[PDB]
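Why run this: before we spend reagent on co-expression, it is cheaper to look at a predicted model of the complex and decide which construct boundaries make sense. The entries below are exactly what would go into the expression plan.
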Amino acid sequence: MRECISIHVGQAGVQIGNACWELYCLEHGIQPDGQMPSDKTIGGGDDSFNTFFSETGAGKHVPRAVFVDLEPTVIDEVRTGTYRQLFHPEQLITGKEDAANNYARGHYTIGKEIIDLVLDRIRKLADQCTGLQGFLVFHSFGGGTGSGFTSLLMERLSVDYGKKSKLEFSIYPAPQVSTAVVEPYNSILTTHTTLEHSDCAFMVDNEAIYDICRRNLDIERPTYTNLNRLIGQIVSSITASLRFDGALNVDLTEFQTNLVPYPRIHFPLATYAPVISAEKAYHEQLSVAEITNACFEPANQMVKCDPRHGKYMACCLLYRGDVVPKDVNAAIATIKTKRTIQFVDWCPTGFKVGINYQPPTVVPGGDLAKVQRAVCMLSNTTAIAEAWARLDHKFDLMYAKRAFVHWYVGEGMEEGEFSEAREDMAALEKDYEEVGVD
Amino acid sequence: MREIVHLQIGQCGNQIGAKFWEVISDEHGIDIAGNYCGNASLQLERINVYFNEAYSHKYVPRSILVDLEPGTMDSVRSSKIGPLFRPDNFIHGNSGAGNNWAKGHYTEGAELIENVMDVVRNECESCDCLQGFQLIHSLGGGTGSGMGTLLINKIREEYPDRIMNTFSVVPSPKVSDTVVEPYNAILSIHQLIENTDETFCIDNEALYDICFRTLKLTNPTYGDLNHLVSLTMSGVTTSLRFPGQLNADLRKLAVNMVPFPRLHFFMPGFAPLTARGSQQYRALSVPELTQQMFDARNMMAACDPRRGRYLTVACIFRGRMSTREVDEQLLSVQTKNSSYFVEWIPNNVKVAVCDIPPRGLKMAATFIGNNTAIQELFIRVSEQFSAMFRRKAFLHWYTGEGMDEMEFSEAEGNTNDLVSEYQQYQDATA
Ligand SMILES: COc1ccc(C[C@@H]2NC(=O)/C=C/C[C@@H]([C@H](C)[C@H]3O[C@@H]3c3ccccc3)OC(=O)[C@H](CC(C)C)OC(=O)C(C)(C)CNC2=O)cc1Cl
Ligand SMILES: Nc1nc2c(ncn2[C@@H]2O[C@H](COP(=O)(O)OP(=O)(O)OP(=O)(O)O)[C@@H](O)[C@H]2O)c(=O)[nH]1
Ligand SMILES: Nc1nc2c(ncn2[C@@H]2O[C@H](COP(=O)(O)OP(=O)(O)O)[C@@H](O)[C@H]2O)c(=O)[nH]1
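The model came back. Tokens follow.
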């Protein structure tokens, strides 16, 4: 009755989604060939992981995934890896020429020559689903494919699937690991284009994942594998309310109502407490109050911004593992006695706690330690305006002398689209300030 | 013989209506099988207003239980009152409106309103004479508020010569955490101003206040609030269910109590209000019942009647009391506190005495008043609407169902005009 179609656009989206589907199969106990030991005894669907894993007649749990790139490198990497038979070769779309870290290449010239094939695969996956809610688009703000083709895909899915709500798991660019200089240009342009076509966007920057990996997993050179494993853990326990039993956030509509008051203020912030290294596994344990405090710690967020200077709107505390619901309320009361967390001046509800008793599973061989108590804090705040202000500051710095603009006007785009996207992000900054001023 | 068609829309309307029909059948001496088992012939007289007498002395209610979800129908059928109701009169959709007034007034209400109008016409065709319609619903939710005002408009279209009485439960932030309940409340208040002749403004804030302070409950559930509303709604319709001097049979009650066509929002009250299992320790007499009848702490709408003027009062006393002492105490209340009643409506306090008390209480005092203090309730809901509307929170869920954004401003302007009219008739002196 509820079905979701995960879409992974770009290299970042494809790698993050491959790690995410690995952790989904690890959490649900699904074998890499597609069969299931326990829940294939029934042999039927609608067991709350039929939102993501479609079941064939042979008992294979093929995921509802579409992997898109304009470069065949990472698609062949997932076609060669341990889940090569789990994903259908029709749904793994490759390309010939890249977007070359250009928004206008992936949105107007190179992405326009492949958009109908991806739309055909999306409709072929949607025709199997009888209760489809929407899509989870995995992409990146910085790259060419993950910005331009994601914006083109969001336009096509809004004009074709207008009764559906589309989530996003975007990758905000970081200067520590950056493939390009024009990542502010692509980020501002795809945020302007996917503002009217996205319903709840969970942007996560690699700077916060970089800092968390370096300060917790003790890796001073974090590669893309450690970042991929950590963001796969983050997104897997984001979606753990959706693939499991019903407490809260069981639908994409529930995601859009519990956190998102405005059509344009739709950028929540996730926070995860038990990010501990695999060496420090049996040193101590972690109580509910301290992991709630670390979920309210500004250094543990998935976005490098300060929430105490802004005002909250919502909080969906999502607990994993064997957590008793008694001391969660004591943790809530100790958080509430701290007046740093300051909600808006409407009826603010509070920390909507839902508890899933399935223990969290980490990847064997990964740097994340196996833990018994895990917690995800989806919070809508006005602190994301700091990240958008940083992006528009870099955009203004590069656009003051019109640097790199010829790489965009030469691929079909107009000159005034940059000023239009700058004005739209200025309006988003004004909206976040108007919520922030009471 | 006149007869009222009862309608319950929504979860709150269905639960309050189930408790209400239980208290009414207990007062009338009717068990769950539809057989009369009382010891008084006064209970059987004027039974046709609410209970449909079938063959072989079968008293089924004329209740039309409406929802958009079957869970409330299953919960009603799980109680003892499920076999009591007519099983053909249960109507439920596939999915609830989900606290969306537009989704309960424009799409799901539109697709279910033909079936509920078919059931309404089926109840109406067997009438020797129709008196009017009684509706219990909540202004906060989606199906209750939206489909209630849609059914009100459809009934006003089909039967424009029949009175329309509503028991509208105004939502509170102290009992529900949903944020858009001012939107549904203000849009339903805008519909109830223009399309209803009688409205009993029950406020969940006042019920929470009574259960918090008076009843000494730390965590007031929905059961205690529904017990309070069931007591007050049994007391209000004791003029309709029984013959008396102040009979007030719906149209007569609207003629007495409503001086102006938009100022039809009443302020119900019940003087010996006690929690369940503790009503056997209350001393009962006449002047204490009269002094608790007009108490702001006892009144069941979150208003201060000392800050307003009673336009019209209909005090009904229940139990075995001397009518001389009741009339003496009420004339003493009207004369000693003559600043709280209007001078341009002479003899606006009407007293009736019914000898049948509600069960569990030897003496009761149930009060209906068209007080001017209900503008405080409308100011509170309109200020919460303005706080949620000045920065357009969750308007995409309403404008995505085809609702214009001018309709919210029209509802705000209509409720503000109603508040202005209440203030004008408060400040005016003869
Ligand atoms: C500062 O901002 C906030 C303050 C508090 C909160 C807490 C948050 N408040 C809201 O979600 C307000 C929602 C507006 C309506 C909107 C108007 C409905 O038409 C939407 C709709 C949805 C589904 C189907 C049809 C129609 O949604 C609901 O009623 C949802 C629908 C559920 C049943 C799925 O139900 C709830 O509310 C829950 C899940 C039971 C509890 N929710 C809350 O405590 C959030 C924010 Cl962002
Ligand atoms: N966390 C994480 N981020 C990644 C990963 N791969 C790429 N990125 C991010 O991706 C951003 C740029 O996008 P690209 O990697 O070039 O992918 P793309 O969107 O397809 O762009 P093109 O390949 O040029 O078409 C960089 O800023 C990186 O931060 C990854 O595996 N994990
Ligand atoms: N007094 C009282 N109010 C209730 C009760 N149940 C629900 N409510 C109120 O009524 C509203 C619920 O409306 P509902 O019929 O459920 O609409 P729905 O959500 O679309 O199904 C909420 O605002 C509650 O505040 C009850 O038992 N007693």
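Residues B 10-12, 15, 96-99, 138, 140-144, 169, 171, 175-176, 181, 204, 207, 222, 225-226, 229 surround guanosine-5'-diphosphate (ligand 3) (CB under 6 Å). The longest strand of chain B covers residues 310-319. Bring this page to Monday's planning discussion.
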